[PDB]
């Protein structure tokens, strides 16, 4: 009843502060929060990424690491 993206965004309510990447940009790239550190996980492929730095692109870094992802295909 309401966009997947926004359901993925809701898992960020607990995301730790001062992470230099957008919650919005994480959920947009298909990743929801795991509740551990700054580790997030793509609902589609199961790809786990953490330790995020400035100018990182979750969208790009997704494509680079697992391009077979039915989701990433967009």
């Amino acid at each position: 009843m309401l966009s997947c993206e926004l359901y993925r965004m809701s898992t960020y309510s607990t995301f730790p502060a001062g992470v230099p990447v957008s919650e919005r940009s994480l959920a947009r790239a298909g990743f929801y929060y795991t509740g551990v550190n700054d580790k997030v996980k793509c609902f589609c492929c199961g790809l786990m990424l953490d330790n995020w730095k400035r100018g990182d692109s979750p969208t790009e870094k997704h494509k680079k690491l697992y391009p077979s992802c039915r989701f990433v295909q967009s």
Partner: protein, 62 residues
Amino acid sequence: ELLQRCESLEKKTATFENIVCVLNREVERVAMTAEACSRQHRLDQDKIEALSSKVQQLERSI
């Protein structure tokens, strides 16, 4: 049913509270941006005034 319409209300609701809690954070990051950027131009309007002052004196020599 009411045992269940209501457990549904609980769920739909927590999701909204959680999503709006993320947007609060988003907006306040955005405020720091607008503020940092508004109050920096305060300088940028001074360097501009210094310039056009130098350019007028330089225009009056040439």
